Ligand binder design. Structure first.
Ligand code: NAI
Ligand code: NAI
Ligand code: NAI
Lengths: 477, 477, 477, 477
């Protein structure tokens, strides 16, 4: 338009009266597709205060009724699927096929979470005291907040708000300043179906301003955020002031282990069909590939051939490409610098390794060989489509190198030996380990990272429980 | 002696080579009973590095074997019970009877926790994918740290190390600089029974130095601490730098609600026999008493009479007193100032209200009437034996005032009406609610505070789980 | 028609070739509404063999896919709701309003059960052996059977088949010979949506013949049945021959306790609005009323007035009545005999007590006073609308008399005292206890009777688990 | 002596006044070692009535106090370990080493079970009704009974009474008429430590008499039994009369699968060191050995050599033998007949195959080759040390043949391929599957058989739950 978006506070869209706006750009063409308010703490406070006023009534509603509200939202999403998918493609730069999957998955995820209504249980504990009953109830936290990243922006809205609402909490969400459009569409659905005012709020702005208020406001019981480790650190430090609970997912460096006795065809496909599910921008797919000698040569060749076939370009104009552009300028620059450094350190460029120059932010699928566990490229989130390869002799070497990281969210291994599999599972220090398949968490699993990958977690029963707290009642006589 | 204590690092006692020492004083006589090293970050690092080296081997041990080690420690504690009780009395200032209970309870707690060995379960989750198994294993965090307060110093050692060790973690503990003696005795038992080196480490020093290193060191998977909200804030802020998990218990202002239809005798006894279980220094017993009109006069009189009978003095020389001295000078001063402020604001002194002057730090049982929810005494941890009383008309008023606090750890109510009880339980926003009995958490319950009272929790199954993290394995075909 | 119904075996309706048929009559008019085959063991065997052939493929399907099939069935039911409700009214004799509720509830129940797909969990247990993993998987039983009663005939189909199918089992169902029509309609929906052949089978006939084969066939992993204790005994005895698992619900004599401090209005309404939800033919609503002296007179009068307003008649022609006819002739006769015996024993008829003579099987709402715990009417399922009332002095007397029964499925009490409630809960020996409300189990609860009321149970997580068995895997190294 | 044993009823030993006695013989020498009363139903009734009188008070005791009682019993057992081991050796015919293990294991098992005291949980379920709480409590069944077999006679006492007592139930136990001595010693310990009268009762006699009364008495909430499928059938049929819950373990035909890629050394040792842990009389060790072609010849030879080294004889006079005598004459006879039949059918005797003639009941380790899945020896519990071997080509053949049995308690497989292991686990229809190790259930697992192997189960959390039933409370407002 470029359309100027309003925030969603206390059951209604509120037109921004400030003079400062933030431009939302299309990563493929660099053109301005929309504008959002340069929100400030006060805007966050209004949303938080509204969420607080609505929380008692919301938690008082039988759980099945909150589930009913969630189902109305998912149904609204499916009705506007193509519209929302296009928004994601346009601002996030991901290929049409993946955007479509994200939208459909988000709706299914919400429905799945709504099913917890009559299932989350409190407990009755035996007491040492005659005639006493120890009742442990599961209560809502109260007001919660969600801070979202640019990757899987739409899904992450649901990943936080669905469990939050189901358990009786209210929420205030802030999407990334780079991908707010899909979030506005989510708010419109919430508004259209009539969700009780204050239960779901959407605030817009930067991390340093709005994000910080969502983390530091004393009325917030828990702050949930997904994205960079740097932002997570600032969020937690701020939450500390009020002893506010934090729920963080800060990505990492997913390592992949390919053994000699591994199904070469399966391994290569799993690694490329994972590093491709979002222009090589996801936090679950192998960013560190370890291949042992015995099969090294064969593996590197097939993998090299697979990456050559990977075409990049504008997602909106090409439905036959496997990769879109990077989110923004800084992202592209950091990729270049890291690849260059790697090369200077001794890394062998088997493919790509040269940034494209022109409209949008494109970087060619890059394959690096003769890489050393020591090199900085093995200890720095490379955003773009860069695959560093490291050879090894024994399982212990591979497991040891994979564990050698400040991140511990996702891992994977390919082999056919029972002992090797059980050994890798026991030795790998990660929240997730994929065996002979591609990386992608199920809604009923538990996406939780070790070390700097995060705190708490998301999805399944355990993800739902992050939004609940206990009240232990000692009923005497 | 005054004996000069060494630290316990990597399976052996290490003599302090520094020139700076911290004097440990007897709160009843102000005499120096011992001295501990003015530990520094480097000392904490040595302990942490030792804990890291021992962790893999320790976690590799079958759980029942770790339990066996824990049982040896509890047995060592019971053998030295009277010796340890005296240490607690001497440095903590608590009465002989309570010290004895703390020691016996600590041993039982350790045994109870050891019983979790073959019981904590991982899970097997149904997958949407044909032939796939989703295995969710429960793994240890790795290296953990514990920072302890002066109240219930001995028990708190076990409250953190027992669950930690059982689940395969190693630990580094720092007792409060005011009550380290009981902790040294704990370390001697660990050393005598031969616990594998590095699994249990004891470092000595101040919070700003040693404590901060236990919270900020990158090798620490989780930092556990009990004490003041101010220290908890600094601990969490520091942990944020490395996205380190935190487990905090920061006390509060336990409110008590006395209804008209309440067993007057029971209520009064429960409130005084709780505010007395540690010279009125515990974080679970009523520090805010709400009494409704109908029974106000009767209740205040019986309560006043009960408090007059409360004798204070040196725990070591008197086994017939209900109260000992406050932990230190600053503690005593803060109590005076808060009582004085309360009075100036309109508070009516029905008993006590005047600090004692002489050796040690004694403050008389104080009863304040005509107090207003507004007054600062209702929003500030009063350490000493001060009981503020506030009258009310309806249950809703009492519940509303009790919830009006930045703390939400413990609560209580006295009544005989089914509807009133269920209403109080549903309305009270606390981690714990005691009905018609005194405040004291069971080892099988879950001591976890709401709002600023903390993060995570302790005791029972949920306390044990704080020391475990998940590893989700997607086994395809 | 009277239409002649076929059975549903191995994915298709099979026309009966036998010469013997069973007439299905309308309890209100005694007219023949339909006819079903006088099935024999061989027919059951064909269904069981078909279920066996389909089970491996069915269990092999991801759980969410089985859930998808279940959702198609519930959706089919809602589409034909009015049609099915009429069938129930016509053959079961229940009032239009209750039939409608049963149908809608059945559909919601199926959807609720389908939600367990990704939720039922296996477990990972710590081993005493180094390097060993103990994996406990939840597997299907295989082929299961369901034998249904005439009360809530439609719902009971789902209560057994929904959990059975969800967990990977196949099933063969036999409805009561008195109420098979609603079951045929259920089979048509299964056939129309295309459920894989053999997964759901419907056989028709008597208990002694078809029912016995469903209990005694060696290929059946578990036999599930709801109805009379006499039939349950024969079913279990037969299952014993092959050590076949049994799941039984055999009704009982639900006792109700009315205290002096009880909300008289609430109590009376709860007792009449429960004894009315199916012409006084349900197995959950008070069939034994205990009222204490203090409020006796008041209670008996209000209750007497409430029962006078209860009109009986043909459900199909009257949508303003609270009661329909009894299921059959024998049922009516047994009611008469029991009321008469009661009277001869000293029972005081305060209302009704005289069977109606003419078309259909009607019995007037009957109120009996001055009844003694001793009388046989207190130890015999009275089918019809008969309410025996017994006075008592203390809570202990009431609890003791309520427990004095071979049945222990459902119970209830009305009071406002916290102590009384907790005392009743602790003292009452029943699978269910309702406090200050009417009797009706939630889908997320657990309907399981004590003593002769049954074995195993239905509904919620525990009901779902009845259809699962464990496979413990000891994976060494 | 031969000593004449009294029963243990209502807290005291009761001298038998009947004229009929049953001789207890030493299976190695056929000499009379003791005599027990030929108990009758009335004796069982006295015990059951006593158990009923004590149950309310026992369940009323806090769970930890019941655990304390259990710990006193285990401690009493360890004090008399050698004495009890000798009793088992003498009457059961098992080798000294295994008897010692059984006694020590029994004591550890009791302690393990006592640890459930503060751990078994009830649940709090979300309701669809505003202001309603659904409380699911775990209650005791009441009076339970245990009927024991001759194998692992001592352990089985604890396997039933430990979980029973811990959860608040009382119990009446009847040991096998062939091995009652160890049970009398158990009763003496119970009497000496002072367990409340009626909680633990011991009755003596035959199955047809005393056993039947323990299964058919209306006051019994659940009957638990381990032994032959024939007796289990009679027990369940009788329990049916009162809809009495049953808990059965009826042995079976444990199959073992040896793949070509299997650790030959490990497999052979696991099979012989399992079939030897009780003179080849256990219900968990391979009684059906399936070996594939590729490794057949090698495996059969090593296995043949291992069995030759197996020496048999009097356990009391030889502490260097791997096998004792069979329990009784009928047992020996049935083994002969089955081996002979097998031979006539085409079975090739590679070793043994000829019954010993003289004092006691000895049968030589027998190895049968060229056996066919069809042969009756593959479908009949062979008691003695007979190992039938069957060759196969593919995994599917082995899995299919193993599943081809009316029993489904225990199974095992030896291989090194990840896919093979996961395939065997998924394909094998048994309550237990051992991979690359010998057969022996852990106390924290769940010993539960599929098909005719039983109903319900024992050990771990699930075994404990068999002794608990639910009480669902719907607390409105
Ligand atoms: N926001 C900006 O002005 C600029 C961002 N970038 C790049 O954008 C990328 C976005 O990465 P993501 O994976 O989304 O992770 P991220 O952590 O940078 O952002 C995720 C979410 O956290 C918020 N956030 C950032 N800092 C925060 C703070 N201090 N307190 C509270 N919230 C905060 C963001 O606004 C967003 O909603 C980064 O790699 C960064 O280098 C580059 C130039 C400028
Ligand atoms: N079936 C008949 O020929 C007659 C039945 N009745 C009455 O019908 C009533 C029906 O009561 P419900 O609450 O439905 O309980 P119920 O136990 O009599 O019937 C419930 C279900 O169990 C089956 N069943 C009955 N006996 C069986 C057996 N021995 N083995 C296997 N299955 C068996 C039935 O066919 C039905 O599907 C009884 O009160 C009875 O007196 C009266 C006269 C005849
Ligand atoms: N009891 C006897 O008079 C004789 C027994 N035997 C042999 O003794 C063996 C013992 O085998 P186990 O593995 O112990 O299994 P089992 O089932 O024969 O005995 C286990 C337990 O069940 C009891 N029992 C047996 N029949 C029962 C019934 N109908 N009702 C209630 N309880 C009953 C027994 O008394 C014992 O306590 C059998 O193989 C049998 O052939 C041989 C000749 C006589």
């Amino acid at each position: 338009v470029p359309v100027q978006h309003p925030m969603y506070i206390d059951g209604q869209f509120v037109t921004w009266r400030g003079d400062a706006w933030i431009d939302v750009v299309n990563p493929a063409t660099e053109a301005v597709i929309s504008r959002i308010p340069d929100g400030q703490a006060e805007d966050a406070r209004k949303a938080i205060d509204a969420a607080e006023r609505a929380q008692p009534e919301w938690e008082a509603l039988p759980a099945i009724e909150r589930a009913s509200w969630l189902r109305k939202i998912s149904a609204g999403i499916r009705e506007r699927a193509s519209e929302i998918s296009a928004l994601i493609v346009e601002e996030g730069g991901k290929i049409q096929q993946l955007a479509e999957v994200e939208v459909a998955f988000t709706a299914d995820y919400i429905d799945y979470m709504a099913e917890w209504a009559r299932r989350y249980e409190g407990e009755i504990i035996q007491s040492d005291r005659p005639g006493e009953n120890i009742l442990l109830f599961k209560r809502a936290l109260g007001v919660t907040t969600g801070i979202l990243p640019w990757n899987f922006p739409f899904f992450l809205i649901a990943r936080k708000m669905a469990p939050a609402l189901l358990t009786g909490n209210t929420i205030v969400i802030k999407p990334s300043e780079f991908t707010p459009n899909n979030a506005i569409a989510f708010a419109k659905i919430v508004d259209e179906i009539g969700l009780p005012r204050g239960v779901f709020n959407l605030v817009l702005g930067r991390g340093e301003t709005v994000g910080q208020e969502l983390a530091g406001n004393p009325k917030v019981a828990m702050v949930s955020m997904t994205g960079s480790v740097s932002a997570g650190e600032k969020i937690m430090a701020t939450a500390a002031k009020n002893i506010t609970k934090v729920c963080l997912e800060l990505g990492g460096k997913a390592p992949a282990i390919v053994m000699d006795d591994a199904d070469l065809e399966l391994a290569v496909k799993a690694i490329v069909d994972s590093r491709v599910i979002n222009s090589g921008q996801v936090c679950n797919c192998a960013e560190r590939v370890y291949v042992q000698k015995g099969i090294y040569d064969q593996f590197v060749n097939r993998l090299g051939e697979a990456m050559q076939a990977v075409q990049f370009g504008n997602p909106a104009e090409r439905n036959d490409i496997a990769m879109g552009p990077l989110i923004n300028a800084a992202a592209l620059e950091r990729v270049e610098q890291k690849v260059a450094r790697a090369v200077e350190e001794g890394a062998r460029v088997a493919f790509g390794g040269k940034a494209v120059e022109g409209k949008g932010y494109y970087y060619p699928p890059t394959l690096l060989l003769d890489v050393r566990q020591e090199m900085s490229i093995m200890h720095e989130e490379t955003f773009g489509p860069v695959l560093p390869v490291v050879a090894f002799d024994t399982l212990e070497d591979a497991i040891s190198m994979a564990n050698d990281s400040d991140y511990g969210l996702t891992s994977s291994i390919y082999t056919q030996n029972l002992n090797v599999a059980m050994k890798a599972i026991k030795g790998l220090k990660f929240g997730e380990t994929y065996i002979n398949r591609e990386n992608f968490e199920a809604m009923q699993g538990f996406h939780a990272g070790w070390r700097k990958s995060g705190i708490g977690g998301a999805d399944g029963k355990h993800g739902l429980h992050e939004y609940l707290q206990t009240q232990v009642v000692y009923l005497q006589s």
